[model samples]
Target chain A: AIVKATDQSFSAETSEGVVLADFWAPWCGPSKMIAPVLEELDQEMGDKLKIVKIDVDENQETAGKYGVMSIPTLLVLKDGEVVETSVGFKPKEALQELVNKHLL
Target chain B: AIVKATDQSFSAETSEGVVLADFWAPWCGPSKMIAPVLEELDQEMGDKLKIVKIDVDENQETAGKYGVMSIPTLLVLKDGEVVETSVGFKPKEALQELVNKHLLEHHHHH
Candidate 1:
């Protein structure tokens, strides 16, 4: 299941598990470009990785907390520490590789 | 003049000048909200502060260099050193205060 994450709830979410957060906004063109890929990743990696989505507009404070400056920003967290950050629209295969490498 | 900046040109623009950069994108909802305020400051502080803009989509490397992760990330720079970095959509008055503080401290630092 995709959990809606806020900045305040971010630390708690990533504190003890493997997490992949998608930072995006509804109005973002690039964000739209990346949505289907995230949807696919959510389905493929659901059991192993905790996928979270934080809308930049609705969760502005949370977006800033992560130092997010762009749409489609993805963060990989392990034990609540941010280890890898990927931004911009990327291919699903690349995103899959990112999750596989980080989650395992 | 508001110069269209790229990540590659960022360092040169702020190298020995007082550069206030507005990191934004076209699809950014909040960035549009902050446009007027940036314009106001650009007009008021043109002589003292060089206003520059970098579109994240166009200048990805530059944004990465500064660790920018969100829209409307403003960085106040002097002599190529980042003096202040303000993120998010802020009111005009609050932004003014940030610029004032940076300018005063930066002048003193040099």
Candidate 2:
């Protein structure tokens, strides 16, 4: 399950694990495009990986803090520290590779 | 492919044929939950049914025009007129039934 993350609750959400944070906006086409891919990833690895989404428009404070200037920015975090980041839309395979690279 | 609908382009987008308009918001958790289901529908039925999304915050005009008071409202339209409407979150089976019911109506009419 992909957690709907807000700025206020984000720190606690990603506090202790390898979390994949998807920074997105509703009006963004690319973000919408990758939504299902994220869903599949979440369902496949929910027990091992934490997947969450942050709406950039709604959670500007957190987005700005992370320097997210674009929609569909994916961040891989380990223990609340940013380990890797990628911008724009990526298919499930690419994203799975992204997580596996960091996790392994 | 799901069409990203706006206040300006909604009319032209759903002007003809069977269309599924998903009215949603970013902060709405239920909306997010059903989003992937809509995506699957779009991919599976894009050739027959058009799936579009309207952001309530960005495209208030369309949302208001449809009298949408709730997030994650799914409207089934044929020839730009609403044929069926559902509010709140629904699993993919329910959503597919909604569209199929409307499509069956159209099928019987012909």
Candidate 3:
């Protein structure tokens, strides 16, 4: 299941597993455009990858900490530490490649 | 409350009321500065006015229809028709003045 993360929940949601946190906002066209790709990714890799969404606008604490200047930033965290960061929109295959490299 | 208006919701959201539509982009720094001011305006005028936020980049349909040429363009729409317009990062006072002029009858209150 995709988790909606706020400032309070962000730490715990990405703390343990191979987690993909989508840092995005509603006003971002690219973020809205790439939402489906993330959903499809979750459906296929729910077991190995946990996907959490954080709206950068609402959750400024988390967004500012990560230095997110743009929307649709994809962060791959392994045990709460960031292993990879991908910015902007990417097709499903590209995203899959991103997570596959970080997942066990 | 401030509403996030998309291309699909733009018409209905602005169709029935005195709507203050803010056309902004995520990339614009001036838009970021004016965000808090808008929220403040929403708090004060929530009863008489509806503040709608449109991501110009994403909701190009509405933005294009409004003929928005720049970021942070403020449009006062009454019943889906444009009544007033102001562009760029004006202070909260200026924005309130702009909106007040289009509120119901009109304004020039000292």
Candidate 4:
């Protein structure tokens, strides 16, 4: 399941587990493209993967803190700190790779 | 004339005239600093220039389309096409000079 993280909520939500923080915006085409794809990952990956969504606009501090360059940027965070990041949309399975590495 | 250009409004607003599109965000510190600076240009430059602000977060399509690299990115558009771009905060006069180059003639009409 995907939940939203504004500038205020980002810290509390993303500061735990294997969180894939999706830095995105509403008007971004690629961001919209990756939306359902993330849902698929959320359903398949289950408890091992925690999917979090953050609007780079509403959550600028969090996005800026993490140095997100593009929309649909996926950050794989293990136990709170970012370990890996993907800038653009990738294969749905490649989504697996990002979290699997940390889960294992 | 300082105005905001949303994804929907960007086209009509920048379609003509010497418009400066400012790509900025709410949370950026430098972006906050440049707010009054843009107002200064709005006052001094007046009718010859049009200042359009596009919130990078609120108006992603317009910002992404122009390939704005950083906060406070100022793109000077003459007749709707981009002529010059200044990324990040620059002095007020530097931006004024950028607009003047395109304004050119001492006396001209839209």
Candidate 2 chain A least-lDDT 10 residues: A25-34
lDDT of 1 by residue, B1-110 (tens): 87778877877877777788888886564465667887888888877888888888676788788878767788888888888888776777887787787565444544
Q: What is the TM-score of chain B in candidate 1?
A: 0.86
Off by over 4 Å in 1: A1-104, B104-110
Question: Could you give the candidate ranking by lDDT, starting with the highest?
Answer: 3, 2, 4, 1
Of candidates 3 and 1, the better by lDDT = 3
User: Which of the two, 1 or 3, has more TM-score?
Assistant: 3
TM-score of every candidate: 0.51, 0.50, 0.52, 0.51
What would the DockQ be for model 1?
0.05
- Classified by CAPRI criteria, candidate 4 counts as incorrect
On residues A6-103, what C-alpha lDDT tens digit does candidate 3 reach at each position?
99999998999799888876645456656788889988998999999998768878888887777768898889999898876778898888889887
Residue-by-residue lDDT tens digits, candidate 4, A1-104: 78877888887888888888888775344465578888899889867888889877566787778887666688888888999988766778888887888886
Local distance difference test, each candidate: 0.77, 0.81, 0.81, 0.79
Best by TM-score: 3
Error of 3 at A21 (Å): 0.6
RMSD of 1: 14.4
Q: How far does residue A57 in candidate 3 sit from its true spot (Å)?
A: 2.0
Question: Residues B1-110, candidate 3, lDDT per residue (tens digit)?
Answer: 88899999988998977888888877543465667988899888889989889887687787778887666678888888888887766778998898888776755699
